[PDB]
């Protein structure tokens with residue numbers, strides 16, 4: 080198999096509601112969609128979701144980078160994922176969004192060539208995944224109301240955003256808690272909003288509220304501070320922005336900074352790297368959750384889903400980007416219907432088409 084050509088296009092999908100987190104807001108899912116054509120005719124799909132306030136990447140920069148990658152890999156075999164990353168890495172010292180887009184399309188081609196759904200090439204542990212659904216920052220009573228709604232849809236886990244201040248945040252959780260019950264799992268994400276000691280205070284405050292875990296409580300660069308938190312509460316602390324790639328993961332397991340790690344294809348540059356992170360985490364006894372950027376769509380979510388189902392140590396999933404999309408940019412793959420169960424089929428690759 081040989082890559083004949085690489086095409087990339089912009090994608091802009093209106094979100095059904097304006098999403099808001101501690102780092103900023105977003106109202107449109109704008110990403111880079113790639114299509115890699117082989118000499119034999121097979122076409123693999125990939126996506127690059129740039130998150131300016133998470134990674135600093137932009138759609139303009141992502142599109143430019145993807146084009147440089149596309150011209151550099153013509154003639155290579157998609158199965159040579161090792162060289163493909165070698166090639167991209169020599170071109171750019173940092174562009175996870177661009178790299179993930181190429182990476183994902185290559186794995187899609189691999190699956191299509193082997194005539195196997197992608198999850199089978201990635202470990203084959205399962206052929207489906209269960210995802211939570213996130214609740215963007217808002218008013219305590221508003222979030223509590225939306226919670227009941229998602230639960231009504233069939234969701235058992237809810238990701239709750241916080242970060243305006245330990246005060247209002249605490250009020251937010253409790254409100255939602257005594258609104259849906261105690262059978263529902265509740266994970267919290269503060270996107271680096273708290274200081275070490277105020278983090279310990281806020282978490283302990285929700286001691287009797289039964290929180291599953293707290294995602295990135297402090298600044299991504301304050302590793303000593305993050306470990307401080309992890310080591311003060313018995314509650315499960317997860318690292319997100321503090322862990323982009325495998326080298327980040329190695330540093331965290333070494334220092335024993337957190338309990339769980341959030342993996343995002345758009346942070347590590349693709350499945351190839353995601354595989355590395357999960358392996359390092361599993362070996363260290365740290366489970367992983369597979370996340371997503373608000374800007375990515377069907378292709379990125381589908382790729383992430385196949386990886387999550389395939390790998391045993393990826394025990395949690397936060398693949399809800401397609402739930403807020405007004406329309407689908409492609410056919411097949413993970414539906415936009417808000418449902419916790421994402422079942423992957425027997426279609427080869429990502430199972431996606433124009």
Ligand SMILES: [Mg+2]
Nearest residue numbers: 268294295319
């Ligand atoms: Mg997070």
